[PDB]
Amino acid sequence: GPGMAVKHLIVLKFKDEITEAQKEEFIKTYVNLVNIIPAMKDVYWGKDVTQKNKEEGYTHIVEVTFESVETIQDYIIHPAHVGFGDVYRSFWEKLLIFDYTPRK
Amino acid sequence: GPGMAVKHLIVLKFKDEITEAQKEEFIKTYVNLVNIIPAMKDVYWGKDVTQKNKEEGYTHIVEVTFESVETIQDYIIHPAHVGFGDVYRSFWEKLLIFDYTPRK
Numbered sequence: 001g002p003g004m005a006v007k008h009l010i011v012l013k014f015k016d017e018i019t020e021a022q023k024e025e026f027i028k029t030y031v032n033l034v035n036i037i038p039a040m041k042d043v044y045w046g047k048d049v050t051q052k053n054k055e056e057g058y059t060h061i062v063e064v065t066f067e068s069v070e071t072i073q074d075y076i077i078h079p080a081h082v083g084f085g086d087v088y089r090s091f092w093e094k095l096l097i098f099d100y101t102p103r104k
Numbered sequence: 105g106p107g108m109a110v111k112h113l114i115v116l117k118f119k120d121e122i123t124e125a126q127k128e129e130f131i132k133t134y135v136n137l138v139n140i141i142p143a144m145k146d147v148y149w150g151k152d153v154t155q156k157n158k159e160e161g162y163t164h165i166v167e168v169t170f171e172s173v174e175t176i177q178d179y180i181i182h183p184a185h186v187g188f189g190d191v192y193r194s195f196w197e198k199l200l201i202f203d204y205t206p207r208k
């Protein structure tokens with residue numbers, strides 16, 4: 001179509017002791033970044049329900065739509081993104097980061 | 105619309121010896137499954153461009169929409185899916201699978 005987009009995909013595992021209340025606060029603050037970082041055009045997330053890689057332990061997936069890899073860079077270095085890591089890095093055990101253009 | 109569908113997300117790293125042409129043939133013959141497996145509605149895929157995961161170097165991402173976890177499981181055991189997985193399993197080094205309903 002006429003618009004171009006790049007998807008920023010994050011896969012996440014929280015540390016075992018993190019509470020559901022803490023996860024909720026974490027996620028609310030993350031999705032709120034759309035009100036702070038204009039590069040972020042869409043945010044959708046979900047929790048895995050099938051546990052096909054239970055041993056690896058990733059549970060959460062977030063998809064963020066951007067116009068280009070250049071605006072993704074603006075999001076990465078935005079002070080609110082750095083600050084989110086400052087406050088919440090201690091909540092996650094591991095992450096996977098991907099940037100790609102979905103195609104058929 | 106109000107529908108509550110489920111996304112099937114696959115993240116993959118091929119073995120180092122697999123050629124680009126072989127990866128493309130794998131993807132092409134994976135997308136052909138939409139024509140064979142009733143549950144498989146659509147497929148989008150992409151190649152990661154930012155390479156941020158260090159020792160966990162997944163390269164390819166595929167997203168498939170399904171009605172439900174049950175119809176995902178239909179796709180898993182369908183003989184054309186079993187056959188695809190059987191004969192290409194030696195292609196990949198790392199594989200993660202997630203099933204989730206995207207939400208805001």
Ligand SMILES: CCCCCCCCCc1cc(O)cc(O)c1C(=O)O
Nearest residue numbers: 010012027030045060061062085097
């Ligand atoms: C519904 C779950 C919300 C998960 C939010 C995860 C935020 C991760 C922040 C981050 C940390 C990092 O060390 C490297 C990065 O690339 C990134 C990023 O892409 O945002």
Ligand SMILES: CCCCCCCCCc1cc(O)cc(O)c1C(=O)O
Nearest residue numbers: 114116131134149164165166189201
């Ligand atoms: C653009 C790259 C295309 C990737 C195709 C990956 C095929 C994976 C087949 C499989 C094997 C398995 O052991 C378990 C599973 O759930 C599955 C699956 O979900 O399809």
